[PDB]
Amino acid sequence: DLTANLMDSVFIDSSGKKSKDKEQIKEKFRKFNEGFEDLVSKTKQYKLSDPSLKVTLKSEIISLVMPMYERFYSRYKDSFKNPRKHIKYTPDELTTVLNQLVR
Amino acid sequence: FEYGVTQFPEIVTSFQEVSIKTTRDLLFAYEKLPIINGISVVSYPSKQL
């Protein structure tokens, strides 16, 4: 769902200009962070027992998320002098979050 | 109208300090995980601002 309406949020505003609709910047990127930390939050409820299930769900959801944020992060990282105040994560640090989502 | 480069140096060494204090005021955005145990507010201290 997160990846779904993320790249759908790319799709619906794929029509016009660069995001002078900065509600689209903080729409896609803020609500992406919202649902991302919702998913990390409810990931904490469950603690796995098979190590290969840890590898499995880990690399599955990594392969689900990443290239969207690669082409999309890297597509839209050119909007402010501090995108920091609108966009939060690298793929480096988000990758690290996923890699310590799986303790 | 030119030049006297002590203009230009002090034109820098505050702009960078603006960037660092930008990275202490706006420091508390990027952490940012659940619970949320969000132990610092991203736009916090209006008094101290």
- The SS3 of residue B33 is coil
Among B16, B18, B32, the strongest candidate for a mutation testing the A interface, having the largest count of A CBs within 10 A, is B32
Closest listed residue to residue A35, CA positions, set A4, A77, A68: A4
Residue bearing tokens 């230009």: B8
CA distance A83 to chain B (A): 11
Decide if A30 contacts B32 (C-beta within 8 A): no
Q: DSSP secondary structure string, A30-70?
A: HHHHHHHHHHHHHHTT-----HHHHHHHHHHHHHHHHHHHH
Resolution (A): 4.4
Q: Quick one: which of A67, A48, A55 has its CA closest to A98?
A: A55
A18: left (phi over 0), alpha (psi -120 to 50) or beta: beta
Contacts of A33 in chain B (CB under 8 A): 32
- B8, two tokens: 């230009």
Largest CA distance in chain B: 57
